[PDB]
Design a protein around this ligand. Structure first.
Ligand SMILES: Nc1ncnc2c1ncn2[C@@H]1O[C@H](COP(=O)(O)OP(=O)(O)O)[C@@H](O)[C@H]1O
Lengths: 371, 48, 51
């Protein structure tokens, strides 16, 4: 659980009122909690599992209540299963609690292994929203139709008899908002978000690449409604690395039924992509991210400078004008550096000239080369 | 800051969340047969 | 003299108690149960005493 989002950002008493509303509610929480049976069930089960209980691994289930369990010493024991253990929650590789004296299975322990993919499960999408992105409307509708609508409303596709699209590639110059759009769609539909950065699936170990992608899809399907993001797919996209490609392509198209997990893959060099990975059967949605135009640039300037204190003299149009020379990330860079420049000369209220010299210096640092 | 500190106070007051175990629906399981088998049978080890 | 005799006697009494292991918890399992990791063996779930 998390706090509500207070949506004035200028210092106004509306922001205050929302805040003291929240304080009121949390204070009622405090009040309520401070102003303060099944011993039969406990006396049977939690006394049968006499403390302490060891933790081991389940290998096989042989009978209805008989299973093989290994422990951290590595020994193997054919033990019985007490009736209260959920059989459907038991499978090879599962962590199981065991009676200390007689090693009898006394319950399943929720998994705490596979650390790395557990970290890349992130789920920490809520920093952005479709709000934070402006002007990418065509891309927004495309990705909504491809991945967001089938997750939010698969009813349309099931009623239509349609098997939903099962792969999306995002492409364009860097800093156009591909990663931002992926995070934003992860935020709009609260399906679990999976991110893995390109080259990081390339590994020294021969198996580790395909193994890593296999376990990532395994955890994704385990979370069921999930979105997996591979940024800079080019690192793999453009024998061992080709074998990781084959693993990913078969995880996309191949045997079994994948189900609900969606795949977003972002590239900066789409034309260098190999034909196999761009599967017409799987990857039917390619979304271009062009360099922002005048309207989009204006929207990005408003979005980013919105949280900054601004003077009256700022004429945003001369910043917007000229051509499509730069992307949204460059716009954020101009906003930030204009903030610093206003800070040096001691303005907490950035002016037009600040942005003018900021864009000039950025264009100086933008590209290079002898005449 | 009161938001943050009151959140932490709520968290410490409610305590940690019960991670729990298996324990299939209560009417489904137990019987004295469970404990009788536990105290009667043998936890066999496995050997090649 | 009696103070030193008494402290030696009680120290001898506690000296019979054994090594008590060393453990590190990964996740507490609410009151009592609590999950711990001990160095040579694996994970356990160990009730806590009066503290
Ligand atoms: N249309 C946009 N709206 C808002 N921010 C944008 C937009 N395009 C780019 N950005 C900024 O650029 C960064 C995202 O760059 P992005 O193109 O997603 O990286 P990558 O090329 O690695 O996918 C974000 O910090 C974001 O603030």
């Amino acid at each position: 659980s998390k706090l509500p989002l207070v949506t004035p950002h200028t210092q106004c008493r509306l922001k205050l009122l929302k805040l003291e509303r929240i304080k009121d509610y949390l204070l009622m929480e405090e009040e309520f909690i401070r102003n303060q049976k099944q011993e039969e069930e406990r006396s049977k089960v939690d006394d049968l599992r006499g403390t302490p209980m060891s933790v081991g691994t389940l290998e096989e289930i042989i009978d209805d209540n008989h299973a093989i369990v290994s422990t951290s010493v590595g020994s193997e024991h054919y033990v019985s299963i007490l009736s209260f253990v959920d059989k459907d929650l038991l499978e090879p590789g599962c962590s199981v609690l065991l009676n200390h004296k007689v090693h009898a299975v006394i319950g399943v322990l929720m998994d705490d292994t596979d650390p790395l993919v557990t970290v890349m499960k992130v789920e920490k999408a809520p920093q952005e929203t479709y709000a934070d992105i402006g002007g990418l409307d065509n891309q927004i509708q495309e990705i909504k139709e491809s991945v967001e609508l089938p997750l939010t409303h698969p009813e349309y596709y099931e009623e239509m008899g349609i098997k939903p699209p099962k792969g999306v590639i995002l492409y364009g110059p860097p800093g156009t908002g591909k990663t931002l759009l992926a995070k934003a769609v992860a935020n709009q539909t609260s399906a679990t978000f999976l991110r893995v950065v390109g080259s990081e699936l390339i590994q020294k170990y021969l198996g580790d690449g395909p193994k890593l992608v296999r376990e990532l899809f395994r955890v994704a399907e385990e979370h069921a409604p999930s979105i997996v993001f591979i940024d800079e797919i080019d690192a793999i996209g453009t024998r061992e690395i080709q074998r990781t490609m084959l693993e990913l392509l078969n995880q996309l198209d191949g045997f079994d039924s994948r189900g609900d997990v969606k795949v977003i893959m972002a590239t900066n060099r789409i034309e260098t992509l190999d034909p196999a990975l761009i599967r017409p059967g799987r990857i039917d949605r390619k979304i271009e991210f062009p360099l922002p135009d005048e309207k989009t640039k204006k929207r990005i300037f408003q979005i980013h400078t919105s949280r900054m204190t601004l003077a009256d003299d700022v004429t945003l149009d001369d910043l917007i004008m000229a051509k499509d020379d730069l992307s949204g990330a460059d716009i954020k860079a101009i906003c930030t550096e204009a903030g610093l420049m206003a800070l040096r000369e001691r303005r907490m209220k950035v002016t037009n000239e600040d942005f003018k010299k900021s864009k000039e210096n950025v264009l100086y640092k933008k590209q290079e080369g002898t005449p | 800051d009161d938001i943050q500190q009151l959140l932490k106070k709520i968290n410490e007051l409610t305590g940690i969340k019960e991670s729990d175990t298996g324990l299939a629906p209560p009417a489904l399981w137990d019987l004295a047969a469970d404990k009788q088998t536990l105290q009667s049978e043998q936890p066999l080890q496995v050997a090649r | 003299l009696n103070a030193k005799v008494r402290l030696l006697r009680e120290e001898l009494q506690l000296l019979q108690e054994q090594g008590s292991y060393v453990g590190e918890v990964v996740r507490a399992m609410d009151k009592k149960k609590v999950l711990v990791k001990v160095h040579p063996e694996g994970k356990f779930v160990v009730d806590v005493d009066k503290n």
